[PDB]
Write a protein that binds this ligand. Sequence first.
Ligand code: HEM
Ligand code: HEM
Ligand SMILES: CNCCN(C)c1cc(C#N)cc(CCc2cc(C)cc(N)n2)c1
Ligand SMILES: CNCCN(C)c1cc(C#N)cc(CCc2cc(C)cc(N)n2)c1
Ligand SMILES: C[C@H](O)[C@H](O)[C@H]1CNc2nc(N)[nH]c(=O)c2N1
Ligand SMILES: C[C@H](O)[C@H](O)[C@H]1CNc2nc(N)[nH]c(=O)c2N1
Ligand SMILES: [Zn+2]
Lengths: 407, 411
Amino acid sequence: RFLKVKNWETDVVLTDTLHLKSTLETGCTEHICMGSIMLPTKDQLFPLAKEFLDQYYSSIKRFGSKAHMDRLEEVNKEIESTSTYQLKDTELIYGAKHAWRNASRCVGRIQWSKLQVFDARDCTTAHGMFNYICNHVKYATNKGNLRSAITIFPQRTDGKHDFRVWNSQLIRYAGYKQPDGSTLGDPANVQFTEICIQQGWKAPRGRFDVLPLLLQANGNDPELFQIPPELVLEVPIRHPKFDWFKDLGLKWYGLPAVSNMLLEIGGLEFSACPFSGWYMGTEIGVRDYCDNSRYNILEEVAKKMDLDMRKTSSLWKDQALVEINIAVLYSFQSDKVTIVDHHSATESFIKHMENEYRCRGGCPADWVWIVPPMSGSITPVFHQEMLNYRLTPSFEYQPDPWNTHVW
Amino acid sequence: RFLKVKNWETDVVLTDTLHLKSTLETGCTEHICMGSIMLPVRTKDQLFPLAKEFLDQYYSSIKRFGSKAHMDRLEEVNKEIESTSTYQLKDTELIYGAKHAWRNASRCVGRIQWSKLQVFDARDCTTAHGMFNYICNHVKYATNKGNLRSAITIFPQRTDGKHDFRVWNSQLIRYAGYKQPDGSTLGDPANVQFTEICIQQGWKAPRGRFDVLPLLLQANGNDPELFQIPPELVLEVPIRHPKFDWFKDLGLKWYGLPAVSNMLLEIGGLEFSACPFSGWYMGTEIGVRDYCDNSRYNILEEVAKKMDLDMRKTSSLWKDQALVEINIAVLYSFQSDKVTIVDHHSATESFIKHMENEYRCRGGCPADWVWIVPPMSGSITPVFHQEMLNYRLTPSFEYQPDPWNTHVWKG
Ligand code: HEM
Ligand code: HEM
Ligand SMILES: CNCCN(C)c1cc(C#N)cc(CCc2cc(C)cc(N)n2)c1
Ligand SMILES: CNCCN(C)c1cc(C#N)cc(CCc2cc(C)cc(N)n2)c1
Ligand SMILES: C[C@H](O)[C@H](O)[C@H]1CNc2nc(N)[nH]c(=O)c2N1
Ligand SMILES: C[C@H](O)[C@H](O)[C@H]1CNc2nc(N)[nH]c(=O)c2N1
Ligand SMILES: [Zn+2]
């Protein structure tokens, strides 16, 4: 019932008690581990509210106080009467920070308490959503000195009035299939890119076209908006040693901003809750640049390095991979845009885990996602046992809206 | 019930039904995933169902399920259990058993090869000297002058738990580790405790950076005895780099034969506590783990120095750079000396083809993603993108506690 995790590099053993407060299910059973699978009413609501308000009043050292009891009372009355309830600003902020704190797949969580929360619960239209999002983008970007932020649109009601950002990230590049059979730009967004086209976006049909926002307010049909280009900070990618690198014509955007997730707080569902921080270098250089189903540039780079691409055992892919990742880091650093390398981020995460074990009794962590996609075992997270479990408040996956929405 | 796995690079979706045959626990529950946790005497009572389940599997595999031969064998094993409280495997069942434990080994990327395993039956062995002889023969056979052949040697099964056969070494071939009075380590830090035991038992330590350890062998619950493997039988590869001529002067070598000797083989409820097995290396085991773990040889610094990389900030990715070169060097050295080795790209591609074949022919392939994905360049290998299901099938290889922690000393 009380569980131990060991670091095999340092022998440090930590004891996890926080898991016993776990709520949602993992996908695993005693017979089958699903650790590597990517996606495994009035009655129901008050226990959820109570569990949340209990953790909130505990956090501000007011558990069992009149104000605690009075709020539980007030929320109970409001659910009984309205079928839902509204969070106080203080609860909203606490909830959103804790959803990040509880994100088991996030290596960046040492930062969890410095999150700027933008309350957009007064928003009613897609133009309003566009405005909130431009403001979030500019605040977070901060001329390259990135600051973590979340913007929270109105919560789900009857479920026919959902607010949604259809984009998977606030800032992403277009993808287009051609007669050629291949793909121009980002192949991950081909479908979304065409949804934008079929909605009326005039695509410049290039390799790095910032997609328009497709915003859905109050369950209405989503609408298109171009983010002011002056708000989209982008970085040209060069290498500190290879002068030819720049001629590949690679660039990426400074702001990583997930916009398709659902934020659950005290049983309330916030279906539009875009959040952003700053990149770990490997996200762009390993995943975005080198995944076979992404920009897939390994082959071209290896060629310019004149490596032996004859046999896999020359490790030409591995060599190119490192160089590409050195370039990403160097470019962001040169242009004074916040970025973290995988060594620095994973070391910070170990220190964070230790804080959380010490101060909270644990830290839910998903090893499959935490260990970087390159140089795994030379980062300390590789040797760290982690327990994965689901706490609330949380960020959850939700279905893509084009399958759900009724036009 | 059916379970699907998706490859996120190819969108290929596979369907697992084999998990229905899973028995042992994972350590996970609906409330906690223990997927990254490293380590998560029988009665007649529990033994006959385990025997029956095994023999049903064996007999189906030979297309003789429900045959007279099948039935007579069940009855013979049954009678043997109630009479002697255990039973003996026929040679054919032992071979099938050992091949299947490998096939079922979810942490093993090399399983495409599972059906080519040379099984050496050492169940007539009675003494530590007898074990030494069997292990020498296994090493010579598996080494095959560099043309490595997979093998397992299987000593007598557990009886009352008081007469266990054990190989105390964790691998048949491994280098000594010595902790110095100043706190530094000479040789392999992983093997310090084991090296000290060997020393206490009377091994004369050369005290260098690459001293091949003696074998410490326990037969029939007796105190273990030391033996030196003939050096002519220990194939080693000096490590050099195809382009960096200073790489050789780092003084590195490694042995060619990876041979796990501390696991327990379970077949039909029987426990084979000494079952050393061997294959050939994937380059990263040596180049990433053995050489570059901080708690192992830890050569990243000295290598990066000699490459004149910028070591002042981690964001230069100097460690990543030194890491790749070292791994190039390991593969180059092995290939140049004609010693079997596989790179992590080749090995993972073959694993995916194996895994797909297994889904089609067997209904599944249990796989531990945490172990299967290589410890460098994870996402540029196809396994990173492959969803896997981890579950436990028998026959199986299992961990067991280190014998110095449990052995009753005779004197
Ligand atoms: C401060 C800089 C941050 C860094 C360096 C960071 C790091 C990362 C990395 C490397 C991943 C894996 C992403 C992938 O492979 O797709 C990740 C996932 C995640 N992060 Fe963080 N993060 C940061 C800020 C945040 C913030 C501010 C939040 C929420 C407010 C957050 C919540 C999550 C969630 C929910 C996931 C999983 C998303 C999914 O499952 O696709 N991150 N983060
Ligand atoms: C044929 C060449 C082979 C290759 C390239 C191969 C590859 C590997 C690798 C890379 C690991 C992870 C090792 C570690 O990190 O400690 C492993 C684990 C394993 N392999 Fe294979 N293997 C091969 C043959 C075999 C054979 C012949 C058996 C038994 C018959 C076997 C059974 C296992 C077991 C039981 C584990 C888990 C070890 C543990 O949990 O510590 N392997 N193998
Ligand atoms: C799905 N994961 C692999 C591809 N990568 C690297 C990836 C894809 C998408 C999308 N859509 C989004 C991300 C961003 C994840 C993230 C979020 C935040 C707040 C910060 C950060 N550094 N990364 C990363
Ligand atoms: C414990 N895992 C990391 C250290 N490594 C790489 C490691 C430690 C020990 C031991 N003892 C043994 C091995 C060899 C595992 C193995 C076995 C076989 C049959 C083939 C193969 N390629 N590797 C590897
Ligand atoms: C199948 C496997 O779970 C999938 O490839 C995962 C592995 N680990 C990951 N880790 C991170 N951080 N991000 C990812 O997208 C993935 N993809
Ligand atoms: C804590 C974590 O499970 C541990 O470091 C694992 C990770 N993956 C591994 N994978 C392999 N092949 N071998 C290992 O020793 C490990 N170690
Ligand atoms: Zn699990």
